[PDB]
Design a binder for these strands. Sequence first.
RNA 1: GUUCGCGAAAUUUUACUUCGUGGACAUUUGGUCAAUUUGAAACAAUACAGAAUCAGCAGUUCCCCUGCAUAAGGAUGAACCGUCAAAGAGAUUUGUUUU
Length: 139
Amino acid sequence: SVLLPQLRTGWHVDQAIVTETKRLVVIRFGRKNDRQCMIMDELLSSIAERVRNFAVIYLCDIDEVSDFDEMYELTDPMTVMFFYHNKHMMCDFGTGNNNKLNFIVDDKQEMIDILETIFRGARKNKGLVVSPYDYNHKR
RNA sequence: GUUCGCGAAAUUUUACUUCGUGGACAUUUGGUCAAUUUGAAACAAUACAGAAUCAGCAGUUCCCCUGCAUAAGGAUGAACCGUCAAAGAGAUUUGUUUU
């Protein structure tokens, strides 16, 4: 958890998205007290060093910044989201919501494969990517 | 209350109509192509998932064979033997077989 930096204003979020051209921007929207928010914080905290080349991971709190709540429709304790060149990325996970992310991923390798596949499909301008894993038993 | 099935009646055995009877009798979600159009905001155009394959040499790493170099190291053969050159001056001797 301490490994990943946190974004304390909406402008740190926005500039974090704008100033980074060549690698994905991954934000976890959620609060420190939640049960599901710390788990993806640990999972993403282990993965950050492997992936630092082709992606970077940041942290955002909903109570700290409530500005994006209505715009991206943030519900559930946590939503992970993926941004490439200011463009919100999108991938059909089988969860029925191709936007953002909700559930807690299990294995490191499955999440690194999601990051890798979203990245690779993102370099081609492709809006929708198809994950190798449809988890929809979860949602 | 809806259908399927069996028994009874009114008529031409199956058929309609009604009685006695055995089941079956929920709705949704997980279902978005991406890319592009100077405006009070709609899915209307514009694409439309088409969103290179055989062969050759060389080069790094080790091994062997054969050359040439270099550093060291060895083995053996080779018939004949070492304390000047020129010019000038002085001193001593010099009848017949092989010319």
